[PDB]
């Protein structure tokens, strides 16, 4: 079939297939940013009580749902790509997992703009100056151009130290795990 441009990250399942299709189609025509904007919009537009209620009942003829989606997309004035994707989901019957699609697409667009996820789980509350130095040093792990998306977390369940996730890379320097390690190597 026609060559398609692969995403940067691979997501799997139904949402994986639909998100990959949309991403490759958008890369052609270069409409990625506005496509993501419209995806976020349809997010809410599909959460209104009437729309979210008529798109779960399975006794609404499929064509009825398709036409209602078409009308709503005309009112919201979406790009041809996003309207076609909403249609596609509508007639394939897989619109019940539309939120899975857009979410996946976000994860595919984020990595396109190079914002690696991160995470710092701390022994307890943490200062900001400490957070400043943490960010400044973690930026040392990225590649040339990437950005950091750091989601701090407090955790008294661990004893001390901290856990740092960067993409997949995972460095555990919590006093807890040190205690288990010493007890193990000691037993």
């Amino acid at each position: 079939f026609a060559k398609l441009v692969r995403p940067p990250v691979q997501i799997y399942g139904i949402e994986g297939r639909y998100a990959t299709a949309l991403y490759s189609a958008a890369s052609k025509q270069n409409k990625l940013e506005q496509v993501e904007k419209e995806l976020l919009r349809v997010g809410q537009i599909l959460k209104e009580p009437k729309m979210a209620a008529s798109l779960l009942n399975p006794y609404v003829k499929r064509s009825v749902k398709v036409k209602s989606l078409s009308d709503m997309t005309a009112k919201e004035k979406f790009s041809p790509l996003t309207s076609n994707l909403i249609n596609l989901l509508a007639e394939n019957g897989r619109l019940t997992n539309t939120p899975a699609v857009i979410s996946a697409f976000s994860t595919m667009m984020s990595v396109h703009r190079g914002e690696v996820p991160c995470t710092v789980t701390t022994a307890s509350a943490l200062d900001e100056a400490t957070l400043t130095e943490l960010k400044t040093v973690l930026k040392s792990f990225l590649s040339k151009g990437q950005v950091l998306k750091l989601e701090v977390k407090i955790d008294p369940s661990i004893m001390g130290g901290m856990i740092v996730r960067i993409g997949e890379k995972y460095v555990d320097m919590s006093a807890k795990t040190k205690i288990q390690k010493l007890s193990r190597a000691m037993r």
Partner: protein, 467 residues
């Protein structure tokens, strides 16, 4: 074109090409290994992914390695320089003697000869062995089947057939060891080096060994008979000469196929065998035929599981066999070598329309006399020789003489008996037996014939030992 691995489930890899897929049966090289790992496509699963069966151990493969599409199915060297060498399924030598320097290459997946090519005249392959060539004649381009177990001279018979065909018909041979125990593989290599069919010094070898060991993954034991078929197809086509092809064993070909089919998830058939058993055997037993350029005989060892001759594997093999050679142990105790049984060995071409009226009458008479002697054996054992008249004792004497005369001294077996190899031509065998049946030699001691070639040598031996 470079795809990427995306799954490694056991010995089944799954690659994801993008630009353009490789057609089924193409060989892909996995980049980043030190041992050459070769996958062979087997399906297309949509989404520009292909499910490949791996031809070697798939431990250490990483989702995302690069797999480079070769372009054509598994390719092997097929020159005359593949003679006296050992090469595994993908054509890589494993004799630790260097590269197989050849100018030709052949794909192991080539379709059978078209209908116009097929030769319409059923000939007879003169093996030079009295018993085989008389009672169970081997046919050119026929799928002979060699029954019998170990300890009864099955390797010696193989080497003798190789030597005799190389001398008489001036045609080379091959040996596709499907599922070949490594110990027995080494032993066969050194047996051939001894007997001289393989020669390491001068490049005058008559065998092109191919070995798919018993530990190599299942995907590479199903395709180790196609490698032999291709090495032999080169000789038949590009050199127009007769060829042998020993497939030891032909029950491990079906076993390897069944394992591969199970791995690809296909529903098992009648007795757990693959759903494509008949066609898998057909697309390999159908290149073993005599075209107009040359011919590929084939002597395939057969294992009959649980003595089930109805079992789907020996029931699908027998639909192709054009002969049989039931090596037996009970005939080895008497010392009659080769141990070939005369009363079990069948042959589809043992018909007077093909061999000739003289050959057929002689062979049928030998069979009848041997059956009658086997019957009288019971009466003699139970009651005693007294119980028999001379009208039966004459048949008994003739039968003992014939049972003796069927034994032959092989050339390769010189190490055992010291006697000289006798390549008795077909006419001499026919004359000898037609005469021993006509009573012309009812007086010579039986040991006159034991381990001789023609009948004239038997006369000379009788004269020698009678003084």
């Amino acid at each position: 074109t470079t795809g990427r691995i995306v799954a490694v489930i056991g010995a089944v890899v799954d690659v994801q090409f993008d630009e353009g897929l490789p057609p089924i049966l193409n060989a892909l090289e996995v980049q980043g290994r030190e041992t050459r790992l070769v996958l062979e496509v087997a399906q297309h699963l949509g989404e520009s992914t292909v499910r490949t069966i791996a031809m070697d151990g798939t431990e250490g493969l990483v989702r995302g390695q690069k797999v480079l599409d070769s372009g054509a199915p598994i390719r092997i060297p097929v020159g005359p320089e593949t003679l006296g060498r050992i090469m595994n399924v993908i054509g890589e030598p494993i004799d630790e003697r260097g590269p197989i320097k050849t100018k030709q290459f052949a794909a192991i997946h080539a379709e059978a000869p078209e209908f116009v090519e097929m030769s319409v005249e059923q000939e007879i392959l003169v093996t030079g062995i009295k018993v085989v060539d008389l009672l169970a004649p081997y046919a050119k381009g026929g799928k002979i089947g060699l029954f019998g177990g170990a300890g009864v001279g099955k390797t010696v018979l193989i080497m003798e057939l190789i030597n005799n065909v190389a001398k008489a018909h001036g045609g080379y041979s091959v040996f596709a060891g499907v599922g070949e125990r490594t110990r027995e593989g080494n032993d066969l290599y050194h047996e051939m080096i001894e007997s001289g069919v393989i020669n390491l010094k001068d490049a005058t070898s008559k065998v092109a060994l191919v070995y798919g060991q018993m530990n190599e993954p299942p995907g590479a034991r199903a395709r180790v008979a196609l490698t032999g078929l291709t090495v032999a197809e080169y000789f038949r086509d590009q050199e127009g000469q007769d060829v042998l092809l020993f497939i030891d064993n032909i029950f491990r070909f079906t076993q390897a196929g069944s394992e591969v089919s199970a791995l690809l998830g296909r529903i098992p058939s009648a007795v757990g065998y693959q759903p494509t058993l008949a066609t898998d055997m057909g697309t390999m037993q159908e290149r073993i035929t005599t075209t107009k350029k040359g011919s590929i005989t084939s002597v395939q060892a057969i294992y009959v599981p649980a003595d089930d001759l109805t079992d789907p594997a020996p029931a699908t093999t027998f639909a192709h066999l054009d002969a049989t050679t039931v090596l037996s142990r009970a005939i080895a105790e008497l010392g009659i070598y080769p141990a070939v049984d005369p009363l079990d060995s069948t042959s589809r071409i043992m018909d007077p329309n093909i061999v000739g009226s003289e050959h057929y009458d002689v062979a049928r008479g030998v069979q009848k006399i041997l059956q009658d002697y086997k019957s009288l054996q019971d009466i003699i054992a139970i009651l005693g020789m007294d119980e028999l008249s001379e009208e039966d004792k004459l048949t008994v004497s003739r039968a003992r003489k014939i049972q003796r005369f069927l034994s032959q001294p092989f050339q390769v077996a010189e190490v055992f008996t010291g006697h000289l190899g006798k390549l008795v031509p077909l006419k001499e065998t026919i004359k000898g037996f037609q005469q021993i049946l006509a009573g012309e030699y009812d007086h010579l001691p039986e040991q006159a014939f034991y381990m001789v070639g023609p009948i004239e040598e038997a006369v000379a031996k009788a004269d020698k030992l009678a003084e």
